Task: inverse folding
């Protein structure tokens, strides 16, 4: 089978994968750690992306240009903007934009730079595979538009504005950058996000506990995708 | 000699390099164009970075991880924040920060994420080489702090704020990201910027003309550095 990159937006999302895989090697490279394992006739390369657009762009580029990944699966968390969503809901991104990429001073729309487009799409075949896996695991999986930028946004008015401009369902700091790298390098990309916060709700749950539970589900989910690839 | 990457923040900065080199090849990779030339016992790889942090991170990562660059010289333009600077003045960045990398909601300073630092330094040996070249060409060269982010800022109050927070001398959209990639991959990086706009002053000159004239000077400058490497 093809070589598969598994990127996690938090180190806690990688831990349960490594525990399941058990036998793996690693290298320290690009001020990060990359892990190597065999699973179901696929070679895997895994890493925590590190935080934000630059870090995640670099990690994805290393996985493909250095380690030869042919597919990339990216698990993480996101803040929900769409009122229909709830804490813990799993979303796959259909397309993503950078809300903080701004040369609007020159008459361009927000998120656009010449040489690129506002939105980057993820891979349809991988998304359909994820829907199959969700069905087989009895997990609810929804499609959404993700806005990415290098701020952790707490301003409710800003969340509403990003939603309005991009029709964004959720928001995080690494998705669009990784999707762009993968598209540029002709590597199918899948982006999975668990909703870790809702716009206009005070949390009322422990984040650490949420992360551990969501990471367990996401780890099993992406390994099941690997098994079918 | 070592393999040298020359990155330009505008395609116009690559044109005069190619005109001097005369014999070169080019290919499409990673939704961009990469150029290859031999110069003074060095293999060169050249590219326009494309716009912003993600694009420039990807371009630098490709030049190093795919094309084997061992040193990277990055020429471009920047808006001046330091009142002492004048239009066309050459600045080399001693260190750079991302002004729009913001998890300050969690008690961190602006520009900081765990796993990284606020500032990234450029290579001291390359900076000293640049000072030698500037002296030999009778060109004034100043050291500065550069703030990088994905907005083209026109708000004067915002410029003042970024200058104040980082003690930044100038501002652009690609420097810090490339400096970070190079540091992470153990590649010496040099960042040269010509001042394309002045603190508090409406630009009363043509940008196209400025770019052509500044690019000619910067192209010769970095080739003279290559000759000494």
Result:
């Amino acid at each position: 089978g093809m070589k598969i990159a598994i990127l996690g937006a938090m180190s806690e999302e990688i831990t349960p994968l490594l525990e399941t895989l058990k036998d793996y090697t690693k290298i320290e490279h690009a001020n990060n750690t990359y892990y190597f394992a065999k699973y179901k006739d696929h070679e895997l390369v895994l890493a925590y992306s590190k935080i934000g657009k630059v870090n995640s762009t670099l990690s994805a580029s290393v996985m493909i240009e250095k380690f030869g990944a042919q597919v990339l699966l990216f698990t993480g968390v996101a803040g929900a903007f769409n009122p229909e969503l709830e804490i813990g809901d799993l979303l796959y991104a259909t397309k993503l934009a950078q809300y903080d990429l701004d040369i609007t001073a020159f008459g361009h729309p927000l998120g656009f730079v010449p040489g690129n487009e506002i939105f980057i799409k993820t891979d349809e075949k991988l998304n359909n595979l994820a829907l199959e896996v969700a069905k087989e695991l009895n997990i609810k999986l929804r499609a959404g538009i993700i806005a990415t930028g290098d701020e952790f946004i707490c301003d409710e008015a800003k969340k509403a504005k990003i939603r309005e401009i991009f029709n964004a369902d959720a928001c995080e700091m690494e998705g669009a950058s990784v999707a762009l790298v993968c598209d540029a390098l002709k590597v199918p990309c899948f982006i999975l996000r668990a909703m870790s916060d809702k716009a206009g709700e005070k949390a009322e749950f422990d984040f650490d506990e949420f992360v551990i539970n969501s990471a367990k589900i996401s780890a099993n989910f992406v390994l099941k995708m690997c098994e079918k690839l």
In short: Residues 20 and 204 of chain B are 31 Å apart (CA to CA). Chain B has six helices and ten strands.
